[PDB]
Write a protein that binds this ligand. Structure first.
Ligand SMILES: O=C(O)c1cc(S)ccc1[N+](=O)[O-]
Ligand code: NA
Length: 123
């Protein structure tokens, strides 16, 4: 189900800019992957909530978000590659990233993705 009400501005943009003619799961995933890759301005900084299910703990890491992760798990979720430069590179779910002082378009694209998930939409 949906945890937020429809936002028609986001719906229009998703329809016309992102999903476009996509019909099946792979096409819907691909649309989002290319949109995010095109619209997020890399690199940017974010707080990553890196969770450990086994120990019930959370490490909130401050990282550079370098780009989309290579598209191996594209069908399931949107992943980005992040680095802590204190170099260790990781794969993180975009939905676990809180961007820090980014430009308007990057913030918008992240919000669109968060909105899609909140609505309960899936590829
Ligand atoms: O093959 C790919 O590399 C592929 C990548 C993405 S992001 C989405 C769908 C795909 N399909 O369907 O092939
Ligand atoms: Na980009």
């Amino acid at each position: 189900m949906a945890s937020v009400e429809r936002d028609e501005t986001r719906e229009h943009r998703i329809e016309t800019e992102i999903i476009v003619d996509a019909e099946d799961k792979e096409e819907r995933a691909m649309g989002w992957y290319y949109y995010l890759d095109d619209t997020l301005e890399f690199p940017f900084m974010g707080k990553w909530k890196k969770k450990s299910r086994k120990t019930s703990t959370i490490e909130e890491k401050t990282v550079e978000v370098l780009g989309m992760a290579p598209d191996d798990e594209c069908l399931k979720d949107m992943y980005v590659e992040v680095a802590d430069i204190g170099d260790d590179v990781y794969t993180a779910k975009l939905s676990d990233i809180e961007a820090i002082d980014v430009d308007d378009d990057t913030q918008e694209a992240i919000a669109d993705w968060l909105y899609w998930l909140a609505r309960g939409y899936k590829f």
